[PDB]
Design a protein around this ligand. Structure first.
Ligand SMILES: O=S(=O)(O)c1ccc2cc(S(=O)(=O)O)ccc2c1
Ligand SMILES: O=S(=O)(O)c1ccc2cc(S(=O)(=O)O)ccc2c1
Ligand SMILES: [Cl-]
Ligand code: NA
Ligand code: NA
Ligand code: NA
Ligand code: NA
Lengths: 242, 242
């Protein structure tokens, strides 16, 4: 099932960093990682929680579809792309936290807790603030647990409607060409140590899909590009993407 | 509503050919083209008929989902990519006619003709074989008629389920990066003169979507890549993609 390959550490070493990448080959039901222990250590999901959050908001009707416009509240924040109107596509593309904070407020503590229990998501714990618990509360999830959740989403097996799951899988669209399709979500956990950056999702090939979930030490925002860079180096080494 | 911008013909004559490109700004509700007469000229849809064919087959249960495998029939044909198993995603990417010829045969003439009338698709005529009329039968559709069809598809108001339309819009995925997403379908009509090449779809932006339909004279298969090349040149000139 799980096989360890420490070859991939060089890609983390090359950039003064440490992390874990987890790959799952859907067809052959075989997994791969450079660090079995870290692959199963639970961290704050940060903005990768936007995947379950969107599924919940859509299923409950907080968000009717991917065209509904969530208008900027007018407060100028540090990330410039947040200071504009957004729909679910652009909101997820740019990790617009304010938009998902009002989602969490409408969902409320009870329904959020109930949904995460049914999702089997992480430790299912929403302790902390209603609109910030995935950034500084008690919820935790491992990279392998992200793959378990993601595999349910890919196969439309999560407890919410098939429509909700198809809309989110559309919003996760990051990259696509003649070779592959990447649906994925980035995350950056800055409020509680250890500061880490996430990239979870999958790579759709012609006749297979590879699920991946990576996290890495991230002391500042300047290294965020390595989340995608290091992952793609691993995908190139296994001849998944050219 | 429409306006002619014959500046684009320099992108066609540069590659020794003729054609039309039709754009439609969804937000502004304004259309553009380099030749309004060819824009309204109706040709065989060729494999751009895979868009409505896929909707009909999905709505009728001929195709269960985007993951169902359709086994190669063993007959080795001239396009290598056709001689292997496929699903809806790859069968559309490689324009695998045999796979869609089976779809049509199971849909049948009666339901195909009622569905095309419900879609308002072209001249709604399926005269000829039910398994080849979009390649050598009587169906005819213009570039502007493709845009009307595609607009309904984008808005889920075609007369099939919302599920079927979302799946087809998924299978149309051609290209996606941080700047745009292209959902399109290629076509090469070579059984009845004039031999022409199609590219129809739309470009999803952050705050807008641009529908496009284009066709051009294609005497030999060598020039097929100019379908996308010329379209991207127009889109660049109109400050639609960088
Ligand atoms: O609220 S914080 O400033 O801690 C915060 C929250 C989410 C973030 C997501 C990203 S992401 O672009 O990596 O998704 C980057 C920085 C972030 C900072
Ligand atoms: O059956 S034909 O050989 O006439 C035929 C049908 C569809 C085709 C689609 C393409 S595509 O470029 O639209 O994928 C290219 C050649 C084709 C030939
Ligand atoms: Cl998609
Ligand atoms: Na997105
Ligand atoms: Na944090
Ligand atoms: Na179906
Ligand atoms: Na023709």
């Amino acid at each position: 099932m799980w096989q360890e390959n420490k070859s991939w550490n060089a890609h983390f070493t090359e950039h003064k960093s440490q992390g874990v990448v987890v790959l799952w080959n859907e067809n052959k039901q075989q997994g791969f990682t450079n660090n079995l222990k870290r692959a199963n250590q639970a961290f704050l999901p940060a903005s990768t929680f936007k995947i379950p959050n969107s599924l919940i908001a859509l299923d409950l009707g907080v968000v009717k579809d991917e065209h509904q416009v969530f208008k900027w509240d007018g407060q100028t924040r540090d990330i410039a792309t947040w200071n504009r109107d957004h729909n679910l596509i652009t909101a997820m593309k740019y990790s617009v936290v304010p938009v998902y904070q009002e989602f969490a407020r409408q969902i409320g503590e009870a329904r959020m807790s109930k949904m995460l229990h049914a999702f089997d998501y992480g430790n299912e714990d929403i302790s902390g603030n209603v609109d910030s618990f995935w950034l500084d509360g008690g919820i935790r999830i491992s990279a392998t647990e992200q793959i378990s959740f993601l595999r349910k989403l890919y196969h439309n097996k999560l407890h919410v409607s098939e429509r909700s799951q198809r809309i989110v899988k559309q919003a996760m669209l990051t990259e696509a060409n003649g070779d592959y399709i990447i649906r994925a979500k980035t995350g950056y956990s800055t409020r509680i140590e250890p500061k880490i950056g996430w990239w979870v999702g999958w790579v759709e090939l012609d006749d297979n899909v590879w699920f991946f979930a990576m996290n890495m030490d991230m002391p500042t925002s300047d290294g965020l590009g390595l989340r995608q860079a290091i992952t793609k180096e691993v995908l190139k080494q296994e001849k998944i993407i050219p």
